Short mmCIF file of C-alpha atoms and ligand atoms in Angstrom, two decimals:
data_model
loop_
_atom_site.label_atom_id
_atom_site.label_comp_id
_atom_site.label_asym_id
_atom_site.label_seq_id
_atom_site.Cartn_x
_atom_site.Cartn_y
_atom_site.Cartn_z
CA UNK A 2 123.02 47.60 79.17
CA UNK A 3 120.57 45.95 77.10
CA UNK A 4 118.87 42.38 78.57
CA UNK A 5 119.75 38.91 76.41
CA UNK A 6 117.13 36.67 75.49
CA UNK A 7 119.81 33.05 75.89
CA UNK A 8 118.24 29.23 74.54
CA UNK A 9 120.29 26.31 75.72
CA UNK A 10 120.51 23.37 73.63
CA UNK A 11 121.26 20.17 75.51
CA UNK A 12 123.72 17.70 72.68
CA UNK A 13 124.83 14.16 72.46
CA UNK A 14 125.93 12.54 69.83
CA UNK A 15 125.15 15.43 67.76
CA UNK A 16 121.50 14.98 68.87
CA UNK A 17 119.32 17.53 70.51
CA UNK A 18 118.41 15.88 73.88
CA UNK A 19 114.53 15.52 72.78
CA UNK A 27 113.31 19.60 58.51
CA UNK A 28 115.23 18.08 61.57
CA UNK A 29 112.97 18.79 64.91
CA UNK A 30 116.52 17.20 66.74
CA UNK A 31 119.42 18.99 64.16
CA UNK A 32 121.04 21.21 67.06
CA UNK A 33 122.66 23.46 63.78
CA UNK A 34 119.32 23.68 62.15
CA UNK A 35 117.70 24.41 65.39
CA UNK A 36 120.46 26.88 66.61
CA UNK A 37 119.28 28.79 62.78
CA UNK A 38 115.86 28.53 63.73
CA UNK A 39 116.46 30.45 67.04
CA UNK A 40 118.91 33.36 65.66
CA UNK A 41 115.65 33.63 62.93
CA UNK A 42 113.19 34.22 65.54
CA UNK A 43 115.14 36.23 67.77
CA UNK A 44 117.27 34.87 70.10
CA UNK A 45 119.97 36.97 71.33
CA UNK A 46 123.01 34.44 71.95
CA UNK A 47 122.83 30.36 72.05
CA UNK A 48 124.63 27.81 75.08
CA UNK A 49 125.67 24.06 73.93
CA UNK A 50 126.26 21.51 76.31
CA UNK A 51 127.24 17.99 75.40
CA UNK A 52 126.90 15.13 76.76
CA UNK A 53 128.77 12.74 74.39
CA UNK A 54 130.65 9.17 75.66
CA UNK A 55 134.49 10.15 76.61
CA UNK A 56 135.59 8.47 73.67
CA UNK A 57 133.96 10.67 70.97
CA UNK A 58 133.47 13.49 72.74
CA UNK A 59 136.52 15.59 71.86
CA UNK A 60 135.38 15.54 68.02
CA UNK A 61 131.88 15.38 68.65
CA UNK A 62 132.14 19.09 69.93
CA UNK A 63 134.75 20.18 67.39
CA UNK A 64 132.19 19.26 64.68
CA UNK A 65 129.45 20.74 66.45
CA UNK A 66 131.35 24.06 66.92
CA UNK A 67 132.60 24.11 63.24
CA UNK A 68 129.03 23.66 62.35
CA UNK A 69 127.38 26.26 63.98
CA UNK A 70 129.44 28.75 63.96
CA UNK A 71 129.47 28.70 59.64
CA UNK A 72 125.41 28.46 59.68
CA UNK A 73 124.71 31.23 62.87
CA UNK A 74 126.14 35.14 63.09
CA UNK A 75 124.85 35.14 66.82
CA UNK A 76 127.41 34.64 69.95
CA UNK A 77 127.45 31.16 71.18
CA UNK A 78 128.98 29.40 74.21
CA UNK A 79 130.19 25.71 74.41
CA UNK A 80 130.45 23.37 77.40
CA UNK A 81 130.10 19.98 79.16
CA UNK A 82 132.82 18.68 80.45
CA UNK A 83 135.75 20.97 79.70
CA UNK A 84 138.44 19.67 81.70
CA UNK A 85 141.57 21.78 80.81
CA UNK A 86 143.35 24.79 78.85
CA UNK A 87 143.75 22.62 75.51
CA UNK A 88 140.38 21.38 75.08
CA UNK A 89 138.62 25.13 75.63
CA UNK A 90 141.45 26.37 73.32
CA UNK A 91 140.38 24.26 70.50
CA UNK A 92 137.06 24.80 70.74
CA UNK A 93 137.56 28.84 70.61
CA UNK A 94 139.68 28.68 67.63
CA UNK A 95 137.10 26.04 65.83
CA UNK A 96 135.03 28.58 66.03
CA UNK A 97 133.02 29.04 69.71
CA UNK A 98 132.42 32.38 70.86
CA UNK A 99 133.12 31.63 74.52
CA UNK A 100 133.11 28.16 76.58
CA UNK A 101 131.37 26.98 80.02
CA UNK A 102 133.38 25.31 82.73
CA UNK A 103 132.28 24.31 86.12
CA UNK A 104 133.46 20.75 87.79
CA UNK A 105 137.09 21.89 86.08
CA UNK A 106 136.97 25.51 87.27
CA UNK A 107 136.10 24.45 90.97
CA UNK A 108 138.84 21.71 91.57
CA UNK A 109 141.37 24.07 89.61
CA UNK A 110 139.99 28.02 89.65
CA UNK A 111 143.39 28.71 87.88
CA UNK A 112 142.00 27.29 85.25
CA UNK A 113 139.53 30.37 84.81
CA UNK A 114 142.67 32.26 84.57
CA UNK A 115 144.73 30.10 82.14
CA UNK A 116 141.78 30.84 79.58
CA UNK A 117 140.95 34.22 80.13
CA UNK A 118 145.32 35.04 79.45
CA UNK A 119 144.81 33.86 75.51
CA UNK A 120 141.33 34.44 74.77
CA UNK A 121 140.40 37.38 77.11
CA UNK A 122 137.44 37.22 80.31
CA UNK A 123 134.50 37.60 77.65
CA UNK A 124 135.26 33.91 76.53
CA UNK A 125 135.21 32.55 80.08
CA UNK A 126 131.81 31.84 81.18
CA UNK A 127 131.82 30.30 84.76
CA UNK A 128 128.89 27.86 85.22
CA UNK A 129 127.77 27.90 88.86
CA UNK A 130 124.51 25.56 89.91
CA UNK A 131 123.43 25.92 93.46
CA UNK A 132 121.49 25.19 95.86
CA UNK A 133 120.05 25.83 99.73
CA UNK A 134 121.27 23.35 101.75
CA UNK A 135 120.57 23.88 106.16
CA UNK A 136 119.60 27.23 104.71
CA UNK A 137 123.10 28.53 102.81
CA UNK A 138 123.63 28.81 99.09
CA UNK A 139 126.17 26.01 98.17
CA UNK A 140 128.24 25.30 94.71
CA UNK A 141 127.25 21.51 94.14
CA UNK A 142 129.47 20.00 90.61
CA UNK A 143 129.41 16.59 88.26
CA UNK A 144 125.81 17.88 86.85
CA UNK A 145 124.75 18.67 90.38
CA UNK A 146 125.67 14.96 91.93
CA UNK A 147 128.31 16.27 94.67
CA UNK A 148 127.90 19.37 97.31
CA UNK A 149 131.31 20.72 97.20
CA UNK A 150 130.56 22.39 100.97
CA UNK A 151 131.61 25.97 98.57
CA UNK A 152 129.41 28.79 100.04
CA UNK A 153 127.76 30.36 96.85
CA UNK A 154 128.85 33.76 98.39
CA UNK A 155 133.16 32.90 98.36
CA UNK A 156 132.72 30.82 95.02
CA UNK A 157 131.34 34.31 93.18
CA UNK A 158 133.99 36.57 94.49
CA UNK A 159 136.87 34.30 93.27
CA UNK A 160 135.48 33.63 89.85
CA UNK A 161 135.65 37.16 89.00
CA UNK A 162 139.44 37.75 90.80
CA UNK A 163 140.15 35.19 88.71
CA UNK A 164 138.95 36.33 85.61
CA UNK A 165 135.73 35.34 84.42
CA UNK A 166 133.50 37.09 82.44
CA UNK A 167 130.14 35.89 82.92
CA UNK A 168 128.29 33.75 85.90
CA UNK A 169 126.16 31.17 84.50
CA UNK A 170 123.80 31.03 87.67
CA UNK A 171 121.54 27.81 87.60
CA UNK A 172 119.49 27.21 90.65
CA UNK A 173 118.93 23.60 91.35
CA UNK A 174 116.18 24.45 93.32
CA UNK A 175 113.92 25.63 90.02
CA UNK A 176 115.58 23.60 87.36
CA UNK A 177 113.38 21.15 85.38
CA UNK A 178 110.37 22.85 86.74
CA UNK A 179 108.26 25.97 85.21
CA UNK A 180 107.97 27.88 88.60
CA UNK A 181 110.00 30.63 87.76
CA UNK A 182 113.16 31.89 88.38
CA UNK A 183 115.32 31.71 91.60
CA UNK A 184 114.86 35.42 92.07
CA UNK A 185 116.33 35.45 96.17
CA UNK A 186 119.27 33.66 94.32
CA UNK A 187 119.98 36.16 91.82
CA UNK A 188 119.70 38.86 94.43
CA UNK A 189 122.02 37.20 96.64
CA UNK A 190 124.73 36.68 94.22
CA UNK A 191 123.59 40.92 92.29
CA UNK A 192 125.79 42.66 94.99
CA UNK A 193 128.64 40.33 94.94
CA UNK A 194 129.72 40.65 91.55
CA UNK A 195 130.45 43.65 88.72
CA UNK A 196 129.89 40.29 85.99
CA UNK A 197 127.35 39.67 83.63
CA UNK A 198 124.94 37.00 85.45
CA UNK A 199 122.67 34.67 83.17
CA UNK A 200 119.53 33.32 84.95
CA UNK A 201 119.10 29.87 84.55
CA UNK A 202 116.54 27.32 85.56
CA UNK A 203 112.60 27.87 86.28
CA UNK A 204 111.64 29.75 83.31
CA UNK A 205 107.84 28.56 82.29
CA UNK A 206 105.84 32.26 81.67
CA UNK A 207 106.57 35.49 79.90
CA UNK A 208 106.07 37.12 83.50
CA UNK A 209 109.21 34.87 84.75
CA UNK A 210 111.66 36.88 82.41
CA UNK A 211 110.70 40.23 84.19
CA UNK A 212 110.60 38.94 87.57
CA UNK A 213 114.60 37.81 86.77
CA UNK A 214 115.68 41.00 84.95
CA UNK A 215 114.22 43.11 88.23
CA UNK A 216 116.22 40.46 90.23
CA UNK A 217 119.65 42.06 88.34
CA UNK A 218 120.01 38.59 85.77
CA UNK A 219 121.81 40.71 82.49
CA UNK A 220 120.66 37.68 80.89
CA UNK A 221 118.03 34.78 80.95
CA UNK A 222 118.54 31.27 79.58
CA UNK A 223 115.95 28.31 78.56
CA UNK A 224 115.13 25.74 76.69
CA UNK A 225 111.88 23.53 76.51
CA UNK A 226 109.58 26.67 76.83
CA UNK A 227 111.32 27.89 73.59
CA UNK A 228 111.81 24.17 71.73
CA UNK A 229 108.16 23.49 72.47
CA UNK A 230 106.72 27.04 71.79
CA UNK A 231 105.19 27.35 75.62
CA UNK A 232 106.70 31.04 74.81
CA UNK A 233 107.23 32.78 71.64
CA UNK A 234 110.38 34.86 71.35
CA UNK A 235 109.06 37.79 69.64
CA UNK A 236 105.81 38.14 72.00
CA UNK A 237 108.53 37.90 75.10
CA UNK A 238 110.43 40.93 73.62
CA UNK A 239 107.56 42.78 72.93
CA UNK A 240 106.33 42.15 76.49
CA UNK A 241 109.66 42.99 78.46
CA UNK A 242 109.77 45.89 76.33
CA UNK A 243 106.21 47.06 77.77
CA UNK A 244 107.36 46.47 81.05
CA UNK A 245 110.30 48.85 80.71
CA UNK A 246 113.53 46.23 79.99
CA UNK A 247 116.04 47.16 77.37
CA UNK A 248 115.89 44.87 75.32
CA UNK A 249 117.76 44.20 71.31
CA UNK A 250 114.00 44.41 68.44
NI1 LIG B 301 126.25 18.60 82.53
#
């Protein structure tokens, strides 16, 4: 019922991707303090370290934060989201893995239950159709947006991570016809992701039918304070946690 307010922190080597401005535990406390409804990790850490560069990163957090918070980057398999869960994560991402092997949703969801699956899904308009595109957006799997959707949640997801491509890395708001396009194909939870740059954007999604909205540099570099959003979406009419 109520709308989540979602900040992403980007990770490598236990570094926040740009006391401690770049402490991703410190900076995870900072945002539960100010108001942030639920925090999203994703790592980018060499092969070689990554495996306990997470584990630490999830023991961490989840010790210094009360707040729900989802891991992910290159989840590959059953074993690797299982130890991350029991270290301590709330939920985990997958996306390249859950595309090449949508069991894989499944396999998760049997031990730890749909709320802990969260199903990434970036897209993007390509000869005008929404398509899935994987590997950090580098390959066009030729997935309609529209089939991808429907079999996440027969397979048992529990939330769509929906990141358009299209608005990423810029502030000019939300892909709004690309949450309403996905609204009617799914009963899931959908976070909004990519765009976000004004107060204004946040409404514009929730009317869209996002449950959720996620960013991160208009938070980390105070563009948009969390407590003025609140109090604005509130105004507005969303239900949202104060
Ligand atoms: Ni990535």
């Amino acid at each position: 019922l109520a709308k989540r307010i979602i900040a992403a922190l980007e990770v490598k080597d236990g570094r926040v991707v740009k006391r401690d401005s770049g402490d991703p535990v410190e900076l995870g406390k900072f945002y539960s303090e100010i108001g942030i409804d639920e925090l999203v990790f994703h790592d980018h850490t060499a092969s070689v370290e990554k495996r306990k560069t997470m584990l630490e990163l999830v023991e961490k957090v989840a010790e210094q934060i009360d707040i729900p918070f989802t891991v992910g980057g290159g989840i590959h398999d059953f074993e690797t989201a299982s130890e991350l869960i029991l270290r301590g994560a709330d939920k985990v991402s997958i996306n390249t893995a859950a595309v090449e092997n949508p069991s894989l949703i499944t396999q998760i969801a049997q031990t730890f239950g749909s709320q802990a699956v969260v199903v990434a899904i970036d897209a993007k308009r390509v000869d005008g159709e929404f398509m899935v595109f994987t590997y950090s957006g580098k390959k066009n799997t030729g997935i309609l947006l529209r089939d991808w959707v429907v079999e996440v949640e027969k397979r048992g997801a529990g939330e769509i991570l929906l990141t358009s491509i299209d608005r990423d890395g810029t502030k000019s708001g939300y892909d709004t016809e690309m949450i309403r396009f996905v609204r009617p194909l799914t009963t899931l939870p959908i976070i909004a992701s990519g765009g976000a740059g004004k107060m204004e954007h946040f409404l514009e999604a929730f009317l869209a039918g996002a449950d959720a909205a996620l960013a991160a540099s208009v938070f980390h570099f105070r563009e948009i304070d969390v407590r003025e959003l609140k109090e604005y979406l509130k105004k507005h009419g969303v239900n949202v946690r104060l």
